[PDB]
Design an enzyme around this catalytic site. Structure first.
Site: not given
Ligand SMILES: CS(=O)(=O)N1CCC[C@@H](NC(=O)[C@H](CCC2CCCCC2)NC(=O)c2ccc(CNC(=O)c3cnn(-c4ccccc4)c3N)cc2)C1
Length: 331
Positions: A27-29, A32-34, A50, A162
């Site tokens: 999903v994505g191209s 979003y990464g892997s 992921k 994020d």
């Molecule tokens: C700024 S850095 O230091 O922190 N750091 C750098 C930048 C990224 C930072 N992310 C985080 O830490 C957050 C959690 C912490 C964050 C803190 C603040 C409040 C929000 C959550 N990681 C994530 O949000 C995250 C982790 C895993 C995934 C896996 N699901 C997917 O990918 C997914 C699900 N649905 N879809 C989708 C949507 C529409 C259409 C098709 C597909 C995907 N593509 C997705 C998101 C880390």
């Protein structure tokens, strides 16, 4: 009682996941990464898996991996992304090198949802403020809030996340010139305005142009705010620019719900000490029909002492391995 894995290639990449996850489709191209979509045989629902890329390639990558896992394990709120599973094919620390995360499959982001009705804006912004109240109460600042980091399903239910990988259009001015939590509220202000008008509020081409657009709306800082700039270069700059008046938001968001305008005035203030917080905003009259002070919870405390630590790559990896093993799956 470890599960059974199965290996498979997928677009020049290898994937070893519990048999419980099947029908993986990218999903994505790669945006979003892997990430793959999946069917979870335990529950019968779509999920998103992921696989982190080079999670322990360097000291910095190891710490960022550990940070991401720690933050995801902490989030337990309807308007914040949550961790449904985390796993690795390794049977011991000595062979630990890959990390997989499992979340809900998010529907579409807020860029992909024409202007909305005023009632749609209330609901979406309400849910964002409710999740912000929760993360902020844990001393967690999002810092990168923008429509592509907001997921919304077909019921207009919203979750903050994020994805990583322009941010500047949504960024608080104090952290774009280096002179607290309400940086997130500034970004909500920009998002809310965009939903109302259908237009990016501050589509700056770079940092100086971004600041120029911001002050054209909110005005050049006064002496009250000038007295709080410590950065001497920052003070000189602002005092050299042409003194521009604060605009009245009613003349800019013409025809919008005056409760919406009044809330924008309280979010998009230059002085970060005067900006409305997430909790105060939930009580603004604009959300009168969604506000429930008995169902806007705060978060358990979040121990982020690790962030001030300097450790070697293998220590950050070990700690990540601890968090993988200690993980308890939710209901
Ligand atoms: C700024 S850095 O230091 O922190 N750091 C750098 C930048 C990224 C930072 N992310 C985080 O830490 C957050 C959690 C912490 C964050 C803190 C603040 C409040 C929000 C959550 N990681 C994530 O949000 C995250 C982790 C895993 C995934 C896996 N699901 C997917 O990918 C997914 C699900 N649905 N879809 C989708 C949507 C529409 C259409 C098709 C597909 C995907 N593509 C997705 C998101 C880390």
């Amino acid at each position: 009682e470890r599960p059974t894995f199965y290996r498979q290639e997928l677009n020049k990449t290898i994937w070893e996941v519990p048999e419980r996850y099947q029908n993986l489709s990218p999903v994505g191209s790669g945006a979003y990464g892997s990430v793959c979509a999946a069917f979870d045989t335990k529950t019968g629902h779509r999920v998103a898996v992921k696989k982190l890329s080079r999670p322990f390639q360097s000291i910095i990558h190891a710490k960022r991996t550990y940070r991401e896992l720690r933050l995801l394990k902490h989030m337990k709120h309807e308007n914040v992304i949550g961790l449904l599973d985390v796993f690795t094919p390794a049977r011991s620390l000595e062979e630990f090198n890959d990390v997989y995360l499992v979340t809900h499959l998010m529907g579409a982001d807020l860029n992909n949802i024409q202007k909305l009705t005023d009632d749609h804006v209330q609901f979406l912004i309400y849910q964002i403020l409710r999740g912000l109240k929760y993360i902020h109460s844990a001393d967690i600042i999002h810092r990168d809030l923008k429509p592509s980091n907001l997921a919304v399903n077909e019921d207009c239910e919203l979750k903050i996340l994020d994805f990583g990988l322009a941010t500047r259009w949504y960024r608080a001015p104090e952290i774009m010139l280096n002179w607290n939590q309400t940086v997130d509220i500034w970004s909500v202000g920009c998002i809310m305005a965009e939903l109302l008008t259908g237009r990016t509020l501050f589509p700056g081409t770079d940092h100086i142009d971004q600041l120029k657009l911001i002050l054209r709306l909110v005005g050049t800082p006064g002496a009250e705010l000038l007295k709080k700039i410590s950065s001497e270069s920052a003070r000189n700059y602002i005092q050299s620019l042409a003194q521009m008046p604060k605009m009245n938001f009613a003349n800019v968001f013409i025809g919008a719900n005056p409760l919406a305008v009044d809330l924008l005035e309280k979010m998009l203030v230059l002085d970060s000490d005067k900006r409305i917080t997430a909790a105060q905003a939930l009580a603004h009259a604009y959300f009168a029909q969604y506000h429930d002070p008995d169902d806007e919870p705060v978060a358990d405390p979040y121990d982020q002492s690790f962030e001030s630590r300097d450790l070697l790559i293998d220590e950050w990896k070990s700690l990540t391995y601890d968090e993988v093993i200690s993980f308890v799956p939710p209901p």
